[PDB]
């Protein structure tokens, strides 16, 4: 199984992937919200980062993600992941297992400046936020 550093919000474990962080969104009611936070901290990376969502993914991750802010995430918070991490060689991958939608990217090498980004998994009335922080060396 490929190891995905990220958040699995579905009820099923993938036959292909294992996720570092998991919260079944079917286990919470409509008044609930999920916050799932991942922190990568290495001098150089060789990591698969991604999301397993049984609903809709906002925005078009991981081609585009949200830049985090002390305000409610809005269309003008959409950025290109390329520009957010500021490395040119990001490979993107997508998969589907039932109504679970899997989006991934691969990051290899160092990051010039510590950065974070958010992607949303919306299942009907419930929402789950995945926020990844990636450290620069030091």
């Amino acid at each position, epitope marked *: 199984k490929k190891v995905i550093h990220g958040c699995n919000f579905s009820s099923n474990v993938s036959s292909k992937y294992t996720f570092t962080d998991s919260l079944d969104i079917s286990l919470v009611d409509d008044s609930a919200h999920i916050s799932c936070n991942v922190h990568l901290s290495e001098p150089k990376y060789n990591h698969l980062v991604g999301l397993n969502c049984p609903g*809709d*993914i*906002i*925005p*078009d991750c991981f081609f585009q993600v949200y*830049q985090p*802010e002390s*305000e*409610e995430l*809005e*269309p*003008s*918070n*959409i*950025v*290109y992941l390329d*520009s957010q991490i500021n490395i040119g060689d990001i490979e993107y991958y997508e998969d589907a297992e039932g109504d679970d939608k899997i989006k991934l990217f691969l990051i290899v090498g160092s990051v010039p400046k510590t950065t974070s980004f958010t992607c949303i998994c*919306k299942k009907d009335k419930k929402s789950a936020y995945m926020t990844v922080t990636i450290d620069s060396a030091g």
Partner: antibody
Amino acid sequence: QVQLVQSGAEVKKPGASVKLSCTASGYTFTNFGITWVRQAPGQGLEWMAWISVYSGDTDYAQRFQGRVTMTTDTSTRTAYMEMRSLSFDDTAVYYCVRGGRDSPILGGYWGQGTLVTVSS
Amino acid sequence: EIVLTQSPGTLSLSPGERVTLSCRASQSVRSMYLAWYQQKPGQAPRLLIHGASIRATGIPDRFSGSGSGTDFTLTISRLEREDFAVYYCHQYGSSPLTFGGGTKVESKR
């Protein structure tokens, strides 16, 4: 509280230029773009232009390419849109909206609008 | 260019009735990058929905958005008098950015 405040109404002669301003507060100006939308009297919304305060990249609707230009002053958190060679169908309200940092997007952070009236 | 067609141009109903507005695109909107705006005369547009179904901040429950591909819908479950306005759909998945022509929601008598 994100907020965009636009300059006052303008009356301009045909052929003249106008410089519209849009002053931001409540967020880091240099982390986002500014998107311009125009509304002719009684008409719908039309995307006009976009500028990234972060990188200086721009995009213009083909109708306004070359005739409209943009720039900012980051120390005063003000974005500008300049329109050259105004004609009578440039009479409209021009809105600035907080935009995406990397590509033309807009959202729900709108200025109050600037009316430009082209008249002889 | 993604042309957005809103039909009909005018809808007429009374407070308490359900509103359903339509927005059809000439081709699928990428990743549900669709927004809905409300505008009253003399005011800037107000964002109601983005991402097709995400209610914007400070917008009451009675507004909801749905749809995907070429067909999107803004629903007002029980219209209130302050909801009479023009409503625009908007896509930001493909450049150039485009808007629908608007639907006027109007008081019926």
